[PDB]
Amino acid sequence: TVLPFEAMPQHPGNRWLRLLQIWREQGYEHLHLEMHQTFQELGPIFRYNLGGPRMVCVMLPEDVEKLQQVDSLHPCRMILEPWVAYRQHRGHKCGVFLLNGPEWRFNRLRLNPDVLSPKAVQRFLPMVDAVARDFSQALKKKVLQNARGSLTLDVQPSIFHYTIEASNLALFGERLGLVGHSPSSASLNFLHALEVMFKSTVQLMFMPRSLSRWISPKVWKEHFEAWDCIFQYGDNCIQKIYQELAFNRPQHYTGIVAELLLKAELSLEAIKANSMELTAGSVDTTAFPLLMTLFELARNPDVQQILRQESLAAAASISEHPQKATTELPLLRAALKETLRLYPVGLFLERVVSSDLVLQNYHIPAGTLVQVFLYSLGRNAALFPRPERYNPQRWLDINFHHVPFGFGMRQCLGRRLAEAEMLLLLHHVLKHFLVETLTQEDIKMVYSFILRPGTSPLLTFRAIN
Amino acid sequence: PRTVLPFEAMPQHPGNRWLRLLQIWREQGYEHLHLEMHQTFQELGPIFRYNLGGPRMVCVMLPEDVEKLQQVDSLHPCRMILEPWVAYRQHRGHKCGVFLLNGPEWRFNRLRLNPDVLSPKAVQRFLPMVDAVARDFSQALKKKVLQNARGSLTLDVQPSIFHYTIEASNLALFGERLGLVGHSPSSASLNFLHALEVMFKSTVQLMFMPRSLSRWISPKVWKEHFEAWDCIFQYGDNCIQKIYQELAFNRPQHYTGIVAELLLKAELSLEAIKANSMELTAGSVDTTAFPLLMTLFELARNPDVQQILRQESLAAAASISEHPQKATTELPLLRAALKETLRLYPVGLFLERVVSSDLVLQNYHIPAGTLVQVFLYSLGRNAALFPRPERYNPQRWLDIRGSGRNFHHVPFGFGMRQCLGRRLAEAEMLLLLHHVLKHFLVETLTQEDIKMVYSFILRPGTSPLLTFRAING
Amino acid sequence: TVLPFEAMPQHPGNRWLRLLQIWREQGYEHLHLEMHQTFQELGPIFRYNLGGPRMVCVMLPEDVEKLQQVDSLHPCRMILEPWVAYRQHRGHKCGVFLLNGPEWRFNRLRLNPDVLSPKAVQRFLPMVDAVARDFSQALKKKVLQNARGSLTLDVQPSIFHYTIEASNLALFGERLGLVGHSPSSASLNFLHALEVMFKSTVQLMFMPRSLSRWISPKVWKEHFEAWDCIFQYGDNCIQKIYQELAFNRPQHYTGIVAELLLKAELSLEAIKANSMELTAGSVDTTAFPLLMTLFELARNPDVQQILRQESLAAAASISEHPQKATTELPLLRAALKETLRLYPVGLFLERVVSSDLVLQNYHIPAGTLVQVFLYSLGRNAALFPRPERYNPQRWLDIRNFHHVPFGFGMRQCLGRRLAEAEMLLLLHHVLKHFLVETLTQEDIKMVYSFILRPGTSPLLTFRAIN
Numbered sequence A: 001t002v003l004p005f006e007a008m009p010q011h012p013g014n015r016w017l018r019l020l021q022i023w024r025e026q027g028y029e030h031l032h033l034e035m036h037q038t039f040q041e042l043g044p045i046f047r048y049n050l051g052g053p054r055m056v057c058v059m060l061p062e063d064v065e066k067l068q069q070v071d072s073l074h075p076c077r078m079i080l081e082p083w084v085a086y087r088q089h090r091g092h093k094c095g096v097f098l099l100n101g102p103e104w105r106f107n108r109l110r111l112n113p114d115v116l117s118p119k120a121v122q123r124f125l126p127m128v129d130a131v132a133r134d135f136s137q138a139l140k141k142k143v144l145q146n147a148r149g150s151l152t153l154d155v156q157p158s159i160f161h162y163t164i165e166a167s168n169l170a171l172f173g174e175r176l177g178l179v180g181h182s183p184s185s186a187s188l189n190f191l192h193a194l195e196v197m198f199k200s201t202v203q204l205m206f207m208p209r210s211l212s213r214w215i216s217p218k219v220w221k222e223h224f225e226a227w228d229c230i231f232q233y234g235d236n237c238i239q240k241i242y243q244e245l246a247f248n249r250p251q252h253y254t255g256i257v258a259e260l261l262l263k264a265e266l267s268l269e270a271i272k273a274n275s276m277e278l279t280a281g282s283v284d285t286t287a288f289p290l291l292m293t294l295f296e297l298a299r300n301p302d303v304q305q306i307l308r309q310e311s312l313a314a315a316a317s318i319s320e321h322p323q324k325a326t327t328e329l330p331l332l333r334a335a336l337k338e339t340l341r342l343y344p345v346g347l348f349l350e351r352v353v354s355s356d357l358v359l360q361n362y363h364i365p366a367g368t369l370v371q372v373f374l375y376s377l378g379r380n381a382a383l384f385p386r387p388e389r390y391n392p393q394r395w396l397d398i399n400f401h402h403v404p405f406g407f408g409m410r411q412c413l414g415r416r417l418a419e420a421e422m423l424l425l426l427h428h429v430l431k432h433f434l435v436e437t438l439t440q441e442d443i444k445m446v447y448s449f450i451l452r453p454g455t456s457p458l459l460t461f462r463a464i465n
Numbered sequence B: 001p002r003t004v005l006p007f008e009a010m011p012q013h014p015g016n017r018w019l020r021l022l023q024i025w026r027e028q029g030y031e032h033l034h035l036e037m038h039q040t041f042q043e044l045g046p047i048f049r050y051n052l053g054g055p056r057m058v059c060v061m062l063p064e065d066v067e068k069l070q071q072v073d074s075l076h077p078c079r080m081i082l083e084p085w086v087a088y089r090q091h092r093g094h095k096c097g098v099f100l101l102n103g104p105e106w107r108f109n110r111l112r113l114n115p116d117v118l119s120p121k122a123v124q125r126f127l128p129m130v131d132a133v134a135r136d137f138s139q140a141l142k143k144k145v146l147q148n149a150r151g152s153l154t155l156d157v158q159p160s161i162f163h164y165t166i167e168a169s170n171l172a173l174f175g176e177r178l179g180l181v182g183h184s185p186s187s188a189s190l191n192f193l194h195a196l197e198v199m200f201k202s203t204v205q206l207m208f209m210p211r212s213l214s215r216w217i218s219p220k221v222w223k224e225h226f227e228a229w230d231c232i233f234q235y236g237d238n239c240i241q242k243i244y245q246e247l248a249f250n251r252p253q254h255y256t257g258i259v260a261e262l263l264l265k266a267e268l269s270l271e272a273i274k275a276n277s278m279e280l281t282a283g284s285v286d287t288t289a290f291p292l293l294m295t296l297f298e299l300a301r302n303p304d305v306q307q308i309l310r311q312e313s314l315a316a317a318a319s320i321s322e323h324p325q326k327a328t329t330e331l332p333l334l335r336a337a338l339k340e341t342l343r344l345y346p347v348g349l350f351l352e353r354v355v356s357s358d359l360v361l362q363n364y365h366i367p368a369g370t371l372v373q374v375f376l377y378s379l380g381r382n383a384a385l386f387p388r389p390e391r392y393n394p395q396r397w398l399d400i401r402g403s404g405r406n407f408h409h410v411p412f413g414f415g416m417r418q419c420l421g422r423r424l425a426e427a428e429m430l431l432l433l434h435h436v437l438k439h440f441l442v443e444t445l446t447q448e449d450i451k452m453v454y455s456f457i458l459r460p461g462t463s464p465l466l467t468f469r470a471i472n473g
Numbered sequence C: 001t002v003l004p005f006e007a008m009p010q011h012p013g014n015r016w017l018r019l020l021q022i023w024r025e026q027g028y029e030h031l032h033l034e035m036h037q038t039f040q041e042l043g044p045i046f047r048y049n050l051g052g053p054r055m056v057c058v059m060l061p062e063d064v065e066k067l068q069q070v071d072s073l074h075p076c077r078m079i080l081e082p083w084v085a086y087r088q089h090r091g092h093k094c095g096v097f098l099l100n101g102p103e104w105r106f107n108r109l110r111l112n113p114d115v116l117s118p119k120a121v122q123r124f125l126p127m128v129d130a131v132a133r134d135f136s137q138a139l140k141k142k143v144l145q146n147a148r149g150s151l152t153l154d155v156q157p158s159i160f161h162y163t164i165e166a167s168n169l170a171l172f173g174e175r176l177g178l179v180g181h182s183p184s185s186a187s188l189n190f191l192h193a194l195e196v197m198f199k200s201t202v203q204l205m206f207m208p209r210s211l212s213r214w215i216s217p218k219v220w221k222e223h224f225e226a227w228d229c230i231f232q233y234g235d236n237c238i239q240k241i242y243q244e245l246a247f248n249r250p251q252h253y254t255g256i257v258a259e260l261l262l263k264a265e266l267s268l269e270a271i272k273a274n275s276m277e278l279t280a281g282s283v284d285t286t287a288f289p290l291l292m293t294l295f296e297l298a299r300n301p302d303v304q305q306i307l308r309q310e311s312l313a314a315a316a317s318i319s320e321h322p323q324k325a326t327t328e329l330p331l332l333r334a335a336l337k338e339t340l341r342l343y344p345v346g347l348f349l350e351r352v353v354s355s356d357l358v359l360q361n362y363h364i365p366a367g368t369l370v371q372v373f374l375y376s377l378g379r380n381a382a383l384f385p386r387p388e389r390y391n392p393q394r395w396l397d398i399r400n401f402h403h404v405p406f407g408f409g410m411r412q413c414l415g416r417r418l419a420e421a422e423m424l425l426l427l428h429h430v431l432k433h434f435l436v437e438t439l440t441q442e443d444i445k446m447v448y449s450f451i452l453r454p455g456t457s458p459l460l461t462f463r464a465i466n
């Protein structure tokens, strides 16, 4: 017999002590570890006391399957009040992430063919590969200047300028000149603006506008000033492509955003909104799991040689046809699944369930907030034997086990672009370099809206030839 | 004939010197000056007198009045003493350049400068150098353009155009490649450009009131002005110290710039060469730079005109490639397009002359010693002088040869005191545009008129987003 | 008959007025000229009143000779209290410069074979030559873009980025990409940190910690903040090479520091300490005599053509084998001896005498601090006929302790042969392609900021020869 909602284990804490500790610490850096500990202590399902609303936390793929069933025509997410507040203030339309209901479905169906569809990936994958090549060849040049034919560095800046370049070329069809050169003032300010926006989000996110208004008004300024820079960067991108297309409609493929603009299925204000989400949403999301793959490969050399052997065999066919990298690199794809399992940028999946459902034999009423904690999900030994072990082979021996890009209609729009940028950088890196590190210690993870590593390790890149 | 009316019979400007300075104190500038004077001409006629509470000041806007002004232009045409600029030079112990000199000292400097800066023989010598930089500008742009999928680059051209005018001028004056065209701007270049911007801003603030007033009303502006000049002179002295040392050890056979010829001739003192060299180094940046941009804008706005100029530049492309000095003669339309850009958008704004002997302008008696200002903005926008004045049409300057319109094109002034860098500016402007027209299509969605700002120079308020589409690719 | 210590003429000034003038001026820029004037007024030997300790000042090679014989198995220098204070505070070991006694000798003997030995010079010389070439070819490129086929500039920044690049490649075997490109934020901050550290040394150097701690505490902060930047730069260099070697021990030569790490004769903390002294101690030291040689050559065109003729004849053999530059450039080597004679970056040699000695017929007791002022020594009209005249040929006649800019004995400069290599090769490659010229014929004023550096940098023209 199905147990009532109230029968479920309750989180020991409270929404006020959480609020005050956030005001204090100016963040919630250990949210992932807090929830992971709660799951260890209470079970794979528990309810958070919001003093009225219903909030459930899950960590099982069987529970994600049940959630997808309830999804409905319009899967609902929680309204991200601080973000929506900026758009309302400056008079901008919302992108597909911040949209809900029919307006969301209208935007999404017009976006999927150009951003996510396999036909679209066939078109922008050769562009991504071009930037991926330029990354390794720039590195190789620097590596060969040193006597020991290797360069030791913090790869993070390079990886970020790669994700900026690769995304810009995929969206707008413009080479920014970031890969292989000194970072732009515009790029650094953009990267900093995102970092601040994400930090301030957490600060304003866990309390109503009515409270945060007077408790933290300085944070609201910080947040909006940060968005002002993100939008300044984004609008510059759109103003360029909109003028270029206005005078000449090209024959060939010149990016995702060009497609959207040419089709004119969405309004300019809708294209502007979604273009913003894609320009800013492609930077930190792709670059952090890439840094974590490079680290884990430098940590697990045995895995690195297996992936290198694969990348060297398939090297020739990928050189002739880049779009073959998706199919001819099954282990490298599996390594990325493993990086996202242990290090999810998207700590939790979120749905304000549209109808009643039953999770772990507990009644979950309609309107209930359901959060799928990916950190805990990926770290349960029952479903991932030896979960601490970085093993891509586990994804080849074996269904909702791999949900880092979400699920259903609402699943990550930039999923296939991110995978493409990640696969191709790594394929080109494995082909020429050996990634090595003395930092064998686990990198601590920090919650700043995105689950980012706290520290960047020193990585050696030894030239194979 | 009809009775010549006295000076006092002339319409008087409604405002006053005191309120004007109070406004400039408040606003920290006179950005609307051109529009203020243009409105005054609409309301009072083509001649009016400004009350300076003692001195005689007349304002004109007709070419017929410019003709009468040159008649009075003596052996030594003299202008108003630019007190703030002069003040810096006497404080730091520098000689004055032509622009700041008057009388015999001016004529002595001017006659020794004209053969190497302005003469056609000098233009034949520095033109191939300018063309070399003009080529490098387009080829650097083409490289950037071809990296993008749509084979076009959309940008604010202003920074590029400024680094072109700095590079082109430096190569023409000192025979040195600064490496600005096609590369990241220098800290020196950016600080120099900023220093000029500040100097021009502070000029407007101090030049509308006596030293007796500005010393207490705005002493902070005097500091701001001199600190700005300190940077301009630091840049300028570096240029001259280099060429002076280079020539001291080896006198070259070939042409290596304007300033090299002045130094080799030694007709002027080192302090006179230093003074004039400064005026030419700083005076060649913002001047050539703003009309060149307004041309790019107007062409992006007038595609019909652009294709006519491109067709011309493509036909003459081969002969200009063989001999760059042919660009002056073989590009008559592109030359007239520049006349049209300066007609609408004069970087000058006005021409001063503190008249040497009595004259009559618009049937009014203009006594000796009267300051006369020719407002070029108003002159160029006059519908009776230029039919459909808002229309950008280079063809209006072509079959006017022996039609009396000799005084309609006066953006570089007139007479002996006419702009010294006239022919260098025209060369930098023609050649950049010829090389740009040959490879790119200039396009813009910004069809709305750019507002002009008065900050000593008449500069655009905003810089538009311009697309440069590769014609070939 | 030998004269007592007290019989020696005494410096007119005092410990306290010195201290206060350094407090007021925030430096002792004129020290060299002060001591040089004192020698002119008092003789070639005088004593400084420290109000207890014995301090003697000398300027004759005969006195250096006598100092060498008193040099024990462990020659002593004065403990540089501010520097030692940083290492003690942050828990770092001391390098061979800051060490004394047996600990010094232990470090020294394990350093000499890889840093100073001729066998080591044969290994790092081709690396230095590679950077020296890149310097001239980068210059040539810029020179040829100008109409008069010459570039006029302040060479100082370029020369500094050369010493940084050349030293880094020699020590760690890493190309920093400084030569021929825009200076790094890291390099500029490093150069600035050194400048500050040296300035703040002079300020804290002439008074005890007991006093400097309250009379100038702000200076102690700026000194340590400066060292923090120097150590941040240095530690990155080490952390890179230590990780690189941990995964693969190379077959070929990949720098000085690599050979020390591979030998493991010294502890990692000892290698770190000495590696820091070599990384920071090779920037300013090589740069200033290099910049001064360029200056003296532009004002001595006659000398320049002699050195150029030599460098052009030997050009081919040096191209085939760079290590031949040491032997096949005797005049260029002699020009460097002349640059250091008039422009000693050292300024004064120092020894805390281990046993009694007699200098200039005066009794010098054990424990007495003896300072050899190289500026005055090199400007002595009686041993250097027409001392103000720049003449490399005076080092070739030979009739001997006249050339002591790298010190003397076991304690003689560890980076002597690396500095000479960087200096010779830059100049050889510059002489081969350019003519150095200047209108600045007037002597550059020298400044004392721990190192003897030129106060002003002159404008130097580099005319392409063909």
Ligand code: HEC
Pocket: C096, C097, C098, C108, C277, C278, C279, C280, C281, C282, C283, C285, C286, C289, C340, C344, C345, C346, C348, C349, C350, C405, C406, C407, C408, C409, C410, C411, C412, C413, C414, C415, C416, C418, C419
């Ligand atoms: C890092 C490379 C390095 C370079 C380059 C360098 N030095 Fe040194 N130098 C040292 C070190 C280390 C010592 C300390 C040796 C000791 O006390 O055992 C030293 C010590 C000295 C001493 C003290 C010697 C004594 O007998 O007391 C003098 C003098 C000296 N250097 C002069 C120079 C001069 C002059 C130059 C360049 C023209 C130079 N050094 C360049 C590393 C360097």
Ligand code: HEC
Pocket: A096, A097, A098, A108, A277, A278, A279, A281, A282, A283, A285, A286, A289, A340, A344, A345, A346, A349, A350, A403, A404, A405, A406, A407, A408, A409, A410, A411, A412, A413, A414, A415, A417, A418
């Ligand atoms: C191209 C930009 C872009 C990139 C790159 C990107 N995302 Fe997304 N992502 C989005 C957008 C837009 C949405 C919102 C999808 C929606 O609301 O329909 C989204 C949503 C998501 C969601 C939530 C969807 C759901 O079912 O709730 C997850 C999880 C996610 N992304 C994970 C990732 C991960 C993991 C990466 C990188 C490894 C990543 N994203 C890279 C654009 C991007």
Ligand code: HEC
Pocket: B098, B099, B110, B279, B280, B281, B283, B284, B285, B287, B288, B291, B342, B346, B347, B348, B350, B351, B352, B410, B411, B412, B413, B414, B415, B416, B417, B418, B419, B420, B421, B422, B424, B425
């Ligand atoms: C090479 C430097 C230089 C450049 C470039 C330059 N000028 Fe000049 N200009 C001068 C100098 C010098 C004078 C002063 C000549 C004199 O009055 O003796 C001057 C004077 C003038 C005068 C005053 C003439 C009079 O009769 O009162 C005008 C108008 C003028 N310039 C317009 C321009 C315009 C328009 C441009 C380009 C768009 C320009 N100048 C570019 C150097 C320059």
Ligand SMILES: C[C@@H](NS(C)(=O)=O)c1cncc(N2C(=O)c3ccc(Cl)cc3C2(C)C)c1
Pocket: A097, A276, A277, A278, A280, A281, A282, A284, A285, A345, A346, A347, A348, A349, A412, A449, A450, A451
């Ligand atoms: C890490 C994960 N978080 S989560 C769990 O909430 O989906 C995530 C996944 N995909 C995309 C993102 N985006 C960003 O980075 C970003 C920046 C600026 C804007 Cl305007 C929009 C975005 C989005 C939300 C699209 C974020």
Ligand SMILES: C[C@@H](NS(C)(=O)=O)c1cncc(N2C(=O)c3ccc(Cl)cc3C2(C)C)c1
Pocket: B099, B278, B279, B280, B282, B283, B284, B286, B287, B347, B348, B349, B350, B351, B419, B456, B457, B458
């Ligand atoms: C403003 C415009 N018209 S006007 C009629 O007012 O001179 C103009 C036209 N031609 C040349 C210039 N110069 C400058 O820009 C400049 C900068 C610094 C100095 Cl030291 C000297 C100058 C000059 C006056 C040469 C200015």
Ligand SMILES: C[C@@H](NS(C)(=O)=O)c1cncc(N2C(=O)c3ccc(Cl)cc3C2(C)C)c1
Pocket: C097, C276, C277, C278, C280, C281, C282, C284, C285, C345, C346, C347, C348, C349, C413, C450, C451, C452
């Ligand atoms: C100029 C001369 N002065 S002297 C004669 O008093 O030693 C000298 C000669 N050789 C080397 C140096 N060094 C430096 O420059 C330096 C910088 C930073 C550090 Cl951590 C260590 C050093 C040393 C002392 C090695 C200084």
